[PDB]
Write a protein that binds this DNA or RNA. Structure first.
Lengths: 156, 226, 202
RNA sequence: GGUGGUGCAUGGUUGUCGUCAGCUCGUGUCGUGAGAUGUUGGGUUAAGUCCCGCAACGAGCGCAACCCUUAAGCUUAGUUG
RNA sequence: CGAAGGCGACUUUCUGGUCUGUAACUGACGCUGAUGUGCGAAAGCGUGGGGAUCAAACAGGAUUAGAUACCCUGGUAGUCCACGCCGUAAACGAUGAGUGCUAAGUGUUAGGGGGUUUCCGCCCCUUAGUGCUGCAGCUAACGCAUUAAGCACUCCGCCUGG
RNA sequence: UUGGGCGUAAAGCGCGCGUAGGCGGUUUUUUAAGUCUGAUGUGAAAGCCCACGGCUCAACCGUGGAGGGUCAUUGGAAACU
């Protein structure tokens, strides 16, 4: 189930010699609670198509987040442009404490044991990019030991 | 069959690139030696890439794969169109219209617009129209099959891809790196091998590089169908 | 918008006559008797969403043809509400006899059918989007291509009038042999009037 | 009863720019966005009127006659003309 | 070419310094660079050649609706240079200085390298550079990308609302 | 510091040269100084780890080690300084 989360409504006014438009764009985050997470937007007007074309746009790319279960396996961060996020793994019995673009990809993957020091910008585009571009750069233990050519259980 | 064997390989012109500064710098695996600026393939890898692509076009057609073919440049208007009919596949003859594959729910309609305006002027009730419209009904007709005469019987999605050259069809492999289509082209130098899956660095003046490879390549989708 | 009435653009070019009678001689007296019965004819229908009327005069047989878009309330039960207009037909003037009635399926496909209706959906001033969004979206679901209907006179309660239209598609509204019907209503709101200019299509 | 006042409460409603020919939408694509492509380069024209070539295709409004008529014809009835 | 301000008919004097090539030798003898010392463009404080030309200030004629303004010259120091400086410029490549590494093409300045040769010219290796286009990376983008604002190290200095 | 910038936003004097200072190429051997460990003493009373006791709950006071795992008395190890 491609779990939806909206960010905002919008209005854009292109002042010309004539008249300005009433485009109502948006941007959403679409995860699945499995470690296969996307996000999407669209220059739309319809609040359904603000979801629908963007849910279609998020289903242009669901990124593969490797999840050693129970939390996010490492103490990680994010990076895009002028913004950057941060995640520290923690206990399960906490209650998730994060924000708007830093909680979004973190809650639609079912992990719930993390931190959030959302550094960088306040523009949610490159923020939720950094929430995604950091998270896509995650790696597990078993594939890297395959990639390095050691064994999996040799790493502790 | 599988290879261009070593007699008609060094005597035909399938061991040629062209000069530096019309050069792609990541063709170093496809550079053998300089022949007055013209480089040579290592003529075993270009087969071992393409003989497994021959098996890849075989097993993709074993699941019914319509391996898309493109011949668009003025060397390929009678190279890949002359080979895909010997290969039984769906060619492409004219240029990238701007959403034939990424927006394939509006520009694949031009095949439907050439399957409906044919159906308009095939049967009855075509006569009552003003005759100035039939000028541009037919001007719509010729332009529609100058481009998509290959995709006429292709009312399905393209599963794999064959381009002629990404120097003047760089947007083809851009589509093949956007919609995840496996692509194989007989490129020349100053063409990027990174976005393409099976590169053959062929000089673009040998139709024998087309006639001994690309008809027989999707002959492995006519025989690879079964 | 400094333009002219589009319903005037096809009088006798595309449309037919709603006045197809012949009154040449002594036109003055037997015209005032048409509009002396006419000024009560509309008020008794009680916003019936009438389309239009087609009067006919033939050897003093001035026959009334009112549409009354909602039926039933003009018939009664086999000539009980029809005789009352027939009784007033003999009461205002001498004969005026034999009133009729019609009805309309696809209840919002005519021009004045919507125009009398969407005026009456603006006294309450409740969901001027969704009632018209029920109207226009179902109109193309009732067979329409481009329908253009506006909400003009002083919406919301404001002291300034704000027009609010809804239109799309292909709309050849100026061609000579196309039947275009267009309307106007006077739904006041005790500060300003709703002159509504409707457009529909097929 | 108001021509007593108030276009500026307003319905309208016309004239103007103005023969001015320009004006809008859906799917692509590209942009972090503010936003751009379909109306354009070559040749041909009275005006989104052409064809080639163009990242475009689809959808339009006005767009010419269509309506009335000049004149150039045929056909009808010869009617008081 | 000069660190920079800069450097222009030349012949000569005294030289600086650049650079290549062979690389012989000492065995890192280095970089920043607070202090300090210099240069320090133009104008200004003054002298002697200066008032030939130019020219602040001043003058004249009219235009223009408006003057002596845009037009014009005459003309004062200041100009030119030498003799004292002052210590200021968009002195900006708006990029402090020294070292490693990552796509190219393209001319050009000096030295070494040649193949043919040329009747002194064609092609090509290299060094140091002078330039022009142009990946990955970069930034907010411009634009940079071997004459980095890319990827690393060392030092000084500076900055944190107007 | 962890965890900021100096081309156009605020961040290179006009450039230098240079005194101090800081920081410096490459490859071997000594110390154990700096590094990092191990035997203890071992760091403060309300404040400070963990668990009880006293408070009607509690507000508010003691207990038991933890105990320093940082400092000293002590042994050492040389790549790197």
């Amino acid at each position: 189930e491609f779990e939806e989360r909206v960010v905002t409504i919008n209005r854009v006014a292109k002042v010309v010699k004539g008249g300005r438009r009433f485009r109502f764009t948006a941007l959403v985050v679409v995860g699945d609670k499995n470690g296969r997470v996307g996000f999407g937007t669209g220059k739309a007007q319809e609040v359904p198509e603000a979801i629908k074309k963007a849910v279609e746009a998020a289903k242009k790319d669901l990124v593969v987040v490797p999840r050693v279960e129970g939390t996010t396996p490492h103490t990680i961060t994010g990076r895009y442009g002028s913004g950057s996020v941060f995640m520290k793994p923690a206990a399960p019995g906490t209650g998730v404490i994060a924000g708007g673009p830093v909680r979004a990809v973190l809650e639609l993957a079912g992990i719930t044991d993390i931190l959030s020091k959302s550094l960088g910008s306040n523009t949610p585009i490159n923020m939720v990019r950094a929430t995604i571009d950091g998270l896509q750069n995650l790696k597990n233990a078993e594939d890297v030991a395959k990639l390095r050519g050691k064994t999996v259980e040799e790493l502790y | 069959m599988a290879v261009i064997s070593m007699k008609q390989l060094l005597e035909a012109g399938v061991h040629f690139g062209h000069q530096t500064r019309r050069w792609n710098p990541k063709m170093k695996k496809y550079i053998f030696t300089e022949r007055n600026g013209i480089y040579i393939i290592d003529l075993q890898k270009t087969v071992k890439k393409v003989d497994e692509a021959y098996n890849f076009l075989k097993q993709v057609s074993e699941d019914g794969g319509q391996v898309l073919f493109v011949g668009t440049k003025k060397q390929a208007q009678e190279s890949v169109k002359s080979e895909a009919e010997r290969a039984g596949q769906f060619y492409i003859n004219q240029r990238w219209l701007g959403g034939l594959l990424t927006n394939y729910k509006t520009i694949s309609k031009r095949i439907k617009r050439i399957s409906e305006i044919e159906k308009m002027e095939e049967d009855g009730l075509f006569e009552v129209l003003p005759k100035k419209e039939v000028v541009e009904l037919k001007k719509e007709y010729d332009r529609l099959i100058k481009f998509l005469g290959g995709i006429r019987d292709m009312k399905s999605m393209p599963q794999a891809l064959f381009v002629v050259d990404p120097r003047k069809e760089r947007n083809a492999i851009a589509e093949a790196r956007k919609l995840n289509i496996p692509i194989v082209g007989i490129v020349d130098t100053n063409c990027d091998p990174d976005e393409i899956d099976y590169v053959i660095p062929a000089n673009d003046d040998a139709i024998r590089a087309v006639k001994l490879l690309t008809a027989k390549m999707a002959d492995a989708i006519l025989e690879g169908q079964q | 918008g400094q333009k002219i009435n589009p319903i005037g653009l096809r009088v006798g070019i595309i449309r037919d006559w709603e006045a197809k009678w012949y009154a040449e001689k002594d036109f003055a007296s037997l015209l005032h008797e048409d509009l002396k019965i006419r000024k009560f004819i509309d008020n008794e229908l009680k916003e019936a969403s009438v389309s239009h009327v087609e009067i006919e005069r033939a050897a003093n047989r001035i026959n009334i043809a009112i549409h009354t878009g909602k039926p039933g309330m003009v018939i009664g039960k086999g000539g009980s509400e029809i005789e009352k207009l027939r009784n007033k037909l003999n009461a205002l003037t001498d004969k005026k006899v034999h009133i009729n009635v019609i009805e309309i399926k696809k209840v919002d496909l005519d021009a004045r059918l919507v125009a009398e209706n969407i005026a009456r959906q603006l006294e309450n001033r409740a969901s001027f989007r969704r009632v018209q969004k029920q109207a226009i979206t179902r109109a193309m679901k009732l067979g329409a291509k481009g329908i253009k209907t506006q909400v003009s006179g002083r919406l919301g309660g404001a002291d300034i009038a704000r027009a609010e239209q809804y239109s799309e598609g292909t709309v050849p509204l100026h061609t000579l042999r196309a039947d275009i019907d267009y309307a106007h209503a006077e739904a006041d709101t005790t500060y300003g009037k709703l002159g509504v200019k409707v457009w529909i299509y097929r």
